[PDB]
Amino acid sequence: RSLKKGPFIDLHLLKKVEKAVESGDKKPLRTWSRRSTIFPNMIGLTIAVHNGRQHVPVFVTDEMVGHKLGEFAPTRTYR
Amino acid sequence: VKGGGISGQAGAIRHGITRALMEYDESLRSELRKAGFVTRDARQVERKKVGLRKARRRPQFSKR
Amino acid sequence: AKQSMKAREVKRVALADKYFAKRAELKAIISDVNASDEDRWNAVLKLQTLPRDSSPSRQRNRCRQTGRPHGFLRKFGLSRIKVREAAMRGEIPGLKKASW
Amino acid sequence: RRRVIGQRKILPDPKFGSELLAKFVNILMVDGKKSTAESIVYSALETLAQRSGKSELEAFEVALENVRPTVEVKSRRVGGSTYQVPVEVRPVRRNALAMRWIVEAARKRGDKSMALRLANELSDAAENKGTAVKKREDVHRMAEANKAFA
Amino acid sequence: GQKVHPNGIRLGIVKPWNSTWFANTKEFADNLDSDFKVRQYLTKELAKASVSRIVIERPAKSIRVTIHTARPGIVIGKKGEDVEKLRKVVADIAGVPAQINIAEVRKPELDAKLVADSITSQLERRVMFRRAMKRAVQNAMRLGAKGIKVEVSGRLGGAEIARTEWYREGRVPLHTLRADIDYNTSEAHTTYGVIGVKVWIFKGEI
Amino acid sequence: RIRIRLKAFDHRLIDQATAEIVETAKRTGAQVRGPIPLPTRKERFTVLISPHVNKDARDQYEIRTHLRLVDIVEPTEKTVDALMRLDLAAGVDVQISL
RNA sequence: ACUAUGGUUUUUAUU
RNA sequence: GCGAAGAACCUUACCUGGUCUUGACAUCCACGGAAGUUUUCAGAGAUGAGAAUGUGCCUUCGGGAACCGUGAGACAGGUGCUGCAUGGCUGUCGUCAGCUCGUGUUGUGAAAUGUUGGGUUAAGUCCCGCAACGAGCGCAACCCUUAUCCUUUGUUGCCAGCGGUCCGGCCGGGAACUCAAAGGAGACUGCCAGUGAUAAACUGGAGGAAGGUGGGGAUGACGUCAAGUCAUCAUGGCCCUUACGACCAGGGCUACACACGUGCUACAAUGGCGCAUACAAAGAGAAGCGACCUCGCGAGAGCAAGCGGACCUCAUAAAGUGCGUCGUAGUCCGGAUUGGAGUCUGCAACUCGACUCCAUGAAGUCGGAAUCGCUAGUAAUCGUGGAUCAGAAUGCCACGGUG
């Protein structure tokens, strides 16, 4: 029941996963678009997302997949 | 009669009657003047100052 | 008001000239409540999903003598803080103050 | 101050020729519709003959000759200070003051039909009990213990 | 203190506009924007050609301009043909072919713009500042009129304050709506300042 | 048949143009009636006319568009050729119609 | 039957 | 509720991370290209690299110029600081009756006099009078406009007169209450009474459509508030000028553990609802407003006329009038919140849009000390329209009904 039968998507972040699973102990993969959807094959990865003044880490779970990335991260201050 | 509301039509008809009724007999010509029915009533705009909300109320004023 | 706001809008109107100008009803040959679920008009959609810098939004009329967006009077191209000057300086036909 | 004003005495009712009935429908006028009020007051006698109303010569006079208001209360300044002082009711509101005391008592009552609430309020004035008749008495009993100022 | 533009408050008494053309409700904002910039550009091209006032008209998909000058011979110029380059660019900022007309001013030192360049050219040539106006007034009342006011601001001391000087002759007039005046405001930019000048000329009611 | 859409923003400018086109028609021998004046069309607004806030300073302005049609009923051609290239008072617009 | 408490600085003289 | 009347990317004053600064805007000089149109690929994207499409203008036939995309040198530009510096631009004491000067007089003199006094006015307005007599600015008068009659020109508005009578202003035709337009008269305290130095001047009356600064517009004498604004401009000073430049992918400006205004609508039964039933007025609208017709309970989407202004569209005017019915139950009233299913414009409908229908429906007893506003077509009450406006305010500017 999402807006139109066709979803609006870009594969620009999905194309990074097969390299982000070999990063070692380096700081997580960083992104700025928050309207982006999270596909089921993105599960088990740490991503750094913009909170409005810095970037903070989130881990992809069975609750985050099939939804947008911005729905799982903070957007405001006083916390 | 045509145009206006029925209370406005009464304002047209009541003087259209006297413009005929004063010819109907010489003994009515003084009597309709003694009652004030042979003349146009003195009402005319009366339209709001620039800009009052609706006729009056200086919109959110109440000042002093 | 930064001078880029109008200098970019004139370039976007020139770009709408291939996508929307006499083409804003062109969706009327691809819109349908069902269409038997077939596909035969995607030749239109390939070009309606192509532009990003041209859109039915992102425009502000402004004043033709000041970059300010608000206080504007469309049919003169001037502002509510410019027409009372122009109508006393004699710079505009049809418009006058007082008498009447 | 200046003025000295023009005043209005209003048109009579178009069925009965009564200007007292005209002032009653004006005090009964809400939302400016004015034709609605004609259908609420003097629109039945069968609802007054249901309670205390005896013969049609009293079907409206129970709000007119049945009472005489004289004073209103509140405070007034005399010299450098303010005191509670009964003031002399004006001679043309004299006969139209109890109209509000009946219309308010019926309008604010929770008992459905407004045409029947008004006929029941007129019946409760025809017995000379409680509403409107005690709003006359309360201020007269006050003014019988307050006489030094006018 | 309360005040209004003295020609613009009188414009509602039978006078035409100096921008006098027609346009449709959607093209009007564009036809007005071209009217402003031809009046600007042309009065700058002629800034040393003794010009007073301008009037804009529109023939069928063309533009027509009349300019008033006290030296028509230098505006029509070399062989009486040196006008093509003076219509050439007003046609390029109006988007339509341009047409020229020149008008002669026949009592020049009685025009509200040319008397203001005359007193500018006396303040430039270092006359007594608080007395400069008496020459321009004498020379104007020699040409016609019922009354005149020309007001100077700056360099009138003594102390350097908001002082203004003009002197009384006939009527200004401060009001009379049908006064049928001639009006202008100018700045001389002389004497290390701006030296603000204003002039009102009265010839009689309507 | 011909009509001539003569339009202006001033009630005297259109009378001073009528006094040129209808006189040219009569002097060129055209068979013509009294031309209709038409109901006036208006544009109006009330706006805040002060340069920065001062909320009391709201004032009303209006402008009026006048139109006449002239209307020639007769099919005669030579009598009306004198109108189509004729000069009228500055600021009026003309368009020819049926 | 009456309210203590908000300091301090300003201009025309020339022809 | 004032501007800031329209905050998803935007707009927009700014932050995270990118990227490029003779720059958004103007020429002089320099190089390969017409201006322009498309397609393939990397990058968050801006953008960058290939391959096609076309070869305009001038052509002393010499080869050249607009212009594109860029690089110099002159230069750009600033919600950078500032309305006790100045123009501009707008307000207020204030359309108030205020403000002074010459001659003559007076006082040692600064300075007074007139301008105070009497009767008055819209008013230093007008008459009367003295050691004052006269003059001017503001005022008065004069201006734009309104109620009414006479006279004239008329449409696809109107139908009186006079003809036809698809029986309909639908036509011949016309200018009759009207309507749309114009022209001429009309008002002056002049006319009459009462009052008062039969002075000035006032309240009524007669005429008349109607006065007595009629009502509405509209001008601003010296003096005020160093009035308001550099976030709308010009221009000097101070500052910047690879930056405070400003384009991308995210986004900010609906903050918030916290105090307070102001406004709207109910609580019902002079109410709620349906059917029957009557009158609008002013606006707006050509890739527009969109009729009749269709699918769906519907948002809305199709079919397909009319209309650029009085033969159309938006658009059966509503409150009201008539009739039946529910009836204190914290109620089919009346409203917050909510599940499911749909309708729409848009890169985009997370954060962060509007609209419709089933399913669920909490409060609400007409408000207490106290405080706020309106004087007649004024209060109150119901409906129509538009600007801003992809799509989205209840705010706002106008037009009518009831009273």
Closest-CA residue to F74 (of F36, F37, F30): F30
- Alpha-carbon separation of residue D138 from D74, D90, D93, E5, F44 (angstroms): 13, 18, 19, 68, 60
Using a 7 Å CB cutoff, list residues 37-76 of A near strand H: 50, 52-55, 68, 70-71, 75-76
Name the 3-class secondary structure at F25. helix
- Bases of strand H lying below 7 A from some protein CB: 1-6, 9-13, 15-17, 24-25, 37-39, 43-46, 77-79, 86-95, 137-139, 141-148, 152-155, 158-159, 177-182, 207-211, 214-221, 223-225, 228-229, 231-233, 245-253, 255-257, 268-271, 279-281, 283-284, 287-288, 301-303, 309-310, 319-322, 327-328, 341-351, 353, 365-366, 372-382, 387-391, 396-398, 400-403
The rounded distance, in Å, linking the Cα atoms of C50 and C20 is 12
A62, A39 in Cβ contact below 8 A?
no
- Token pair recorded at residue E181: 């005046």
Dihedral pair phi/psi, residue B23, rounded to 5°:
-90, -25
Name the 3-class secondary structure at F43. strand
Place of tokens 């063309």: E62
Residue ranges of alpha helices (H) inside B1-64 are 6-24, 29-35
The shortest C-alpha distance from E57 to chain F (Å) reads: 7
The rounded distance, in Å, linking the Cα atoms of E201 and C15 is 54
Name the 3-class secondary structure at E69. strand
Place of tokens 């609706």: B54
CB contact under 8 A, C64 and E8: no
The rounded distance, in Å, linking the Cα atoms of E176 and D90 is 54
**CA-based radius of gyration for chain B:** 19
- What pairing do the DSSP bridges indicate for beta strands D71-72 and D87-88? antiparallel
D92, D8 in Cβ contact below 8 A?
no
| DSSP class of D13 | P
- What pairing do the DSSP bridges indicate for beta strands E63-69 and E98-104? parallel
The rounded distance, in Å, linking the Cα atoms of A16 and A20 is 6
- Distance of C1' in H143 from CA in E14, Å: 12
Count CB neighbours of E103 within 10 A: 15
- Residues in contact with A33: Cβ distance below 8 Å, sequence separation at least 6, in sequence order: A10, A12, A13, A69
D113, D82 in Cβ contact below 8 A?
no
| Domain regions of chain C by residue span | 1-90
The shortest C-alpha distance from E107 to chain F (Å) reads: 25
DSSP per-residue codes, E112-134: TTHHHHHHHHHHTTT--GGGTHH
Helix-helix angle E114-123:E133-141, to 10 degrees: 150
CA dihedral A39, A41, A46, A50 (to 10 degrees): -20
Closest-CA residue to B16 (of B34, B2, B5, B27): B2
Place of tokens 């005319």: B44
- Distance of C1' in H242 from CA in C22, Å: 43
Count CB neighbours of A25 within 10 A: 4
- In chain C, how many H helices and how many E strands? 3, 2
List the determination method.
cryo-EM
DSSP per-residue codes, E148-193: EEEEEES--SSS-SS-EE----S---S--TT---EEEEEE---TTS
Calculate the CA E92 to chain-centre distance. Answer: 25
- Alpha-carbon separation of residue C97 from C77, F57, F63 (angstroms): 19, 15, 10
Closest-CA residue to D145 (of D73, D63, D64): D73
Closest-CA residue to E118 (of E103, E149, E140, E102): E140
Name the 3-class secondary structure at E29. helix
Chain gaps in chain D, named by the residue before each (C–N > 2.5 Å): none
- Token pair recorded at residue D4: 């000295």
End-to-end Cα distance, chain E: 28
- Token pair recorded at residue F84: 């189509």
F10, F12, F91 member nearest E21 (Cβ)? F91
Contacts of C76 in chain E (CB under 8 A): 28-29, 32
- Token pair recorded at residue A14: 């999905």
